[PDB]
Write an enzyme that holds these catalytic residues in place. Sequence first.
Site, PDB file in Angstrom:
ATOM      1  N   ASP A   1       3.705   4.380   0.767  1.00 49.04           N
ATOM      2  CA  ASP A   1       2.870   4.761   1.674  1.00 49.04           C
ATOM      3  C   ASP A   1       3.416   3.909   3.078  1.00 49.04           C
ATOM      4  O   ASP A   1       4.342   4.283   3.685  1.00 49.04           O
ATOM      5  CB  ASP A   1       1.479   4.603   1.403  1.00 49.04           C
ATOM      6  CG  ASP A   1       0.676   5.120   2.776  1.00 49.04           C
ATOM      7  OD1 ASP A   1       0.518   6.302   2.956  1.00 49.04           O
ATOM      8  OD2 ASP A   1       0.129   4.145   3.645  1.00 49.04           O
TER       9      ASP A   1
ATOM     10  N   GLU B   1      -7.464  13.775  -0.134  1.00 46.63           N
ATOM     11  CA  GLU B   1      -7.608  12.408  -0.262  1.00 46.63           C
ATOM     12  C   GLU B   1      -9.276  12.161  -0.378  1.00 46.63           C
ATOM     13  O   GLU B   1      -9.508  11.358  -1.333  1.00 46.63           O
ATOM     14  CB  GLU B   1      -7.291  11.731   1.065  1.00 46.63           C
ATOM     15  CG  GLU B   1      -7.589  10.437   1.325  1.00 46.63           C
ATOM     16  CD  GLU B   1      -6.436   9.673   1.673  1.00 46.63           C
ATOM     17  OE1 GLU B   1      -5.088  10.100   1.718  1.00 46.63           O
ATOM     18  OE2 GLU B   1      -6.385   8.595   2.638  1.00 46.63           O
TER      19      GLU B   1
ATOM     20  N   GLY C   1      -2.741  13.990   8.351  1.00 45.76           N
ATOM     21  CA  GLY C   1      -3.866  13.763   9.470  1.00 45.76           C
ATOM     22  C   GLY C   1      -5.238  13.531   8.802  1.00 45.76           C
ATOM     23  O   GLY C   1      -5.104  13.448   7.368  1.00 45.76           O
TER      24      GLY C   1
ATOM     25  N   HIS D   1      -0.272  16.067   2.662  1.00 46.19           N
ATOM     26  CA  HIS D   1      -1.149  14.890   2.150  1.00 46.19           C
ATOM     27  C   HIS D   1      -2.683  15.446   2.335  1.00 46.19           C
ATOM     28  O   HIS D   1      -3.371  15.643   3.490  1.00 46.19           O
ATOM     29  CB  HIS D   1      -0.835  13.555   3.208  1.00 46.19           C
ATOM     30  CG  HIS D   1      -2.301  12.891   3.287  1.00 46.19           C
ATOM     31  ND1 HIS D   1      -3.268  13.165   3.801  1.00 46.19           N
ATOM     32  CD2 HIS D   1      -2.341  11.708   2.620  1.00 46.19           C
ATOM     33  CE1 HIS D   1      -4.194  11.956   3.773  1.00 46.19           C
ATOM     34  NE2 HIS D   1      -3.532  11.038   2.899  1.00 46.19           N
TER      35      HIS D   1
HETATM   36 MG    MG Z   1       0.997   8.102   4.441  1.00 50.25          MG
END
Ligand code: MG
Lengths: 598, 598
Positions: free
Chosen positions: A531, A449, A418, A446
Amino acid sequence: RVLLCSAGHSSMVVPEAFHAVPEGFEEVHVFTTDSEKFNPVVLNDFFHSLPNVRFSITKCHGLADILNERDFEFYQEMLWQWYLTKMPDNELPYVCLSGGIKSMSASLQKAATLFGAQSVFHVLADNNPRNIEEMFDALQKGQIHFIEMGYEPGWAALRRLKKILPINEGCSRDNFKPLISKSIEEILSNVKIMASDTGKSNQLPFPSLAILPPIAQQWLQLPLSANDGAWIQNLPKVDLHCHLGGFATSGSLLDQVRGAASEPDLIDRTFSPQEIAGWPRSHKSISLDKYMELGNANGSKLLKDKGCLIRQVELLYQSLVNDNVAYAEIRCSPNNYADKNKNRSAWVVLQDINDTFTRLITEAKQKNQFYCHVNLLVIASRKFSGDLSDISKHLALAITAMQQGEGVCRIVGVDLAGFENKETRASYYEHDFKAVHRCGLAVTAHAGENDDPEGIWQAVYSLHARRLGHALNLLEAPDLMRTVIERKIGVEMCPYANYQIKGFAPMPNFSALYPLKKYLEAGILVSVNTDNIGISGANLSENLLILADLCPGISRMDVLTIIRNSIETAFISHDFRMELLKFFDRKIYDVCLISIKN
Amino acid sequence: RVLLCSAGHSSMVVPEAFHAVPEGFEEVHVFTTDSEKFNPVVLNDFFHSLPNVRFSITKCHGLADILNERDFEFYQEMLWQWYLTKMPDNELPYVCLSGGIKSMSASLQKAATLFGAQSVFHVLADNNPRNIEEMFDALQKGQIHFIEMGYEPGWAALRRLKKILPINEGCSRDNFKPLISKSIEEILSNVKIMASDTGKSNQLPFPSLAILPPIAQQWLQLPLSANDGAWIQNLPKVDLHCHLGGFATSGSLLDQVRGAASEPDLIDRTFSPQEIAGWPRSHKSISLDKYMELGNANGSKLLKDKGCLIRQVELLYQSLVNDNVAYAEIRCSPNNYADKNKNRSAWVVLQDINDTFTRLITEAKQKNQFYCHVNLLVIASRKFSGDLSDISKHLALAITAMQQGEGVCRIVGVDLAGFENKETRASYYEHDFKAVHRCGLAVTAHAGENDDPEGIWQAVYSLHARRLGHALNLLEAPDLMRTVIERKIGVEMCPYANYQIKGFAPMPNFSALYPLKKYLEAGILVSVNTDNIGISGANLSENLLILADLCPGISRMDVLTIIRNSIETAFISHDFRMELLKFFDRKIYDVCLISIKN
Ligand SMILES: [Mg+2]
Ligand SMILES: Nc1ncnc2c1ncn2[C@@H]1O[C@H](COP(=O)(O)OP(=O)(O)OP(=O)(O)O)[C@@H](O)[C@H]1O
Ligand SMILES: [Mg+2]
């Protein structure tokens, strides 16, 4: 089963060889010189009397007999080619050498002890018969002896040459290619290394890579270049970050996926993605909002239809197989692909996806092609716009998706993906994950980032995550690499996606260096991914290829060790992991040897 | 330079074979059967013209020709024995393969491939020479032709097979022992055993194990037996669970230590062991209690002073080096040896231990010997009732020790051993380890020997432990078994300690079986250790030897995998791990190519 033999003046040795096994041989083949002394008539009659056994003769055309060194070496090379092309694909063959003069017998015996043989033996008749009517009673009298000097295993991987050198039909001595030289140089220069160094022996993964000849082994250490793409096309690969809904966003994929929609009235075909100059080689960094507005063409608006989703799954599988990928984990969000007006619950959507994937896997495996295993990863979204309870729903679904168990494709774990805008890191969701680990799933995350390197620590420890997404700014926290490397925590990264969204070298005005080479030097279990297969506009082959420009000085050993790390960090069982590793090692040897011969 | 050949009806092959290399030769040997057709006069006359070289004739007594299986096996046995006893001490010989019928040709070619040879070759002359002058003229004309098959590196373990049976002083049919045929039947039995085996065949431990000759790998597939002690004795190994406080506690091993007491007075010299009969093969299973009293000869009572501690640590390092252990970690609890009255604080004890270890390592490294890198583990023993605050102190000590950093030896982690119980699980100390993980430390957990499964689950999920002690009852909870496998949480198990505590390798009235074979098959990163050296009465080599009778059906390749797992779960940095891997691969390749002859 098959047998091989060589015959000279003794033309009746083959019938004796066929009688070696009381069960009965199935395939009999003999390699003999051009000498007219060998009589094909008797053997042809004997094998026509038993048509159930296949029969094939090859002859050393152009060489009646061996009288100098060139004749011997040509005959030995042709014999090795014949043995290589006539051995069974899986099982070792049988060998007899009772016929022929010492030269051919010794050559074929060295072939057997070099290429491996199921059983090597000799036949000796006391009464030295000449026609069938004599050794019939000789074997009835028992004077015929079937001697065995011992089984020969041969090298575990030295029949693989049957793929690297297109077993060519043959050639006049002028058109001479010395396979003998290749085998001799490989054996010698990989044994003429003693126990000194031999350091690159362990420094390489896929332990069969040591057997690879040094003529290409040193070529592997050279820095990667953009012109080797063909080679990396043939490399079996592994993908761990491939969103299911990120495939059909541009090109003819959109046309084919919209053509499979059951009702074309509702679909808004007018919407088209905006092009970026030089895509995928963008001249500027692209913002994240621009990223999923480019991906806004796909998503959940058009995949609500069952037929459209089925066609999307089939097309993604076909693209995966065509790219020589062998294993993949597909991230999916069933909740977005469900509705209640047509009575399509998210569980039904997930079950349909599972059934489609397992049917494709089974149908590909039945005909013995190269198929890519696929496992699923349910997305536990950040759940924007309130209504947090949704996430718990997903987790529960995940558990009940895993307990189904039966099938070739399975739900291996969950995901924590998210936006980083809400600053929510681990603790904002930690109240629920005390049960996923109890079941036996796997948790990726994830994170990192564009935020601080703090919450990654909670993700590693509080969540017990086994993989991390992106996190390209790990260089500023060495105390974080200490626990990342020491815990054998894997890291997933997609060079095209993050390069497009944040910008790196060699793109001008961007001075940030890509840390993948530094990560590999530090020892982090790094895995190169895609990805979004569609929106990024580049599959895994070019995604790994671009590293030659993104990180100058990268070598082919680096690519192979990323493949090994991706294999290691997959959410798979132990036995399946070993099976995958064995297949990958065999195929990697095959491709890395076929590439240098061109 | 020596010539090895067999002559039957032909005796003119030998002069040409001698004239092969223009540089000449020094020794020639010829083997033959009892055939009267062979005439030795020609060869004797030819060789008498060159007295500077030495010549001999070997005759196979009681065998004129090969007519059946008994003749073939007898001739093969004597030819192999004669080839073995004629082996030059350090140099591979040259072999000639143009004498007799094809049977000896194939047999001696197999012998050359197995035992090794400098160069094997065939002679051929068109005129088929018979006497001296005419073959000399044929050599002058250049019509002689020489074909060398190739240099055979050979399998370098059947060499000092000479040392056991050089020659059985003319063995006869009434006393013949085909030991070489026993080796061949051993490899054949291995083949028929592994021909339907999966699992293990996957991934050798380190690479460069594939460059070994195929016979070497086939031998490696053989299940380990009690006779292979010397091989693993030469084998480099790794320890991970060794107690410093229980090294010397019986025999003369404590005499030199106590002898080196700083205050030779407060040293008790009257303690005796429990008069254990079968140690270390004690069939009777004693359950703890008697262990600590047995080890009371050493430990706190004797290690208070300084000289005794230094002597003990030097002796332990010497024993570690003597067993070819290339890397080990030692458990210790310095707070148990501190003396405030004598100013000997716990930190002082730890500093002394670290300093003596690093000095010994540097001294060994200066002389370019087999130095055994050693790292330290601090024990946070669960003293429970007594001032639990000390627990925190211990952890603090660790956090303050490894911070000093400089030095070859270091404190790499803590140990949560102690009185394992329902209470003493990971559920009260987990508030304090928040600091420990923030400082790049590793945590083990000695639990499961008498604790419940959920305690192990807490230890692996609350303290974030990376290794486990003993833990023999993992088969009763498949869920935590799986979360152990796919989380790469290693398991340290001590064979001899559990053997003398619990019951395996059945003594009378006990039928429980050791699960190590099942542990390895399931894929756990198991590691064989020693716990204590003295009280157990067995070092690491015998600990690995007892596995043959402890878990029957275990192969030596799995022993190599155990070593790989031991060097996989050790708490060390990536670069040091790579260097250690290189050295281990080197030493193991050398051992399995050289010292495996027995
Ligand atoms: Mg992704
Ligand atoms: N886990 C796997 N993943 C992908 N493919 C597999 C897997 N297991 C088996 N296969 C397939 O089994 C087949 C066995 O092939 P085989 O042993 O006959 O070698 P080959 O025909 O000479 O070359 P190739 O491996 O390309 O087929 C392979 O094609 C491989 O694609
Ligand atoms: Mg212990």
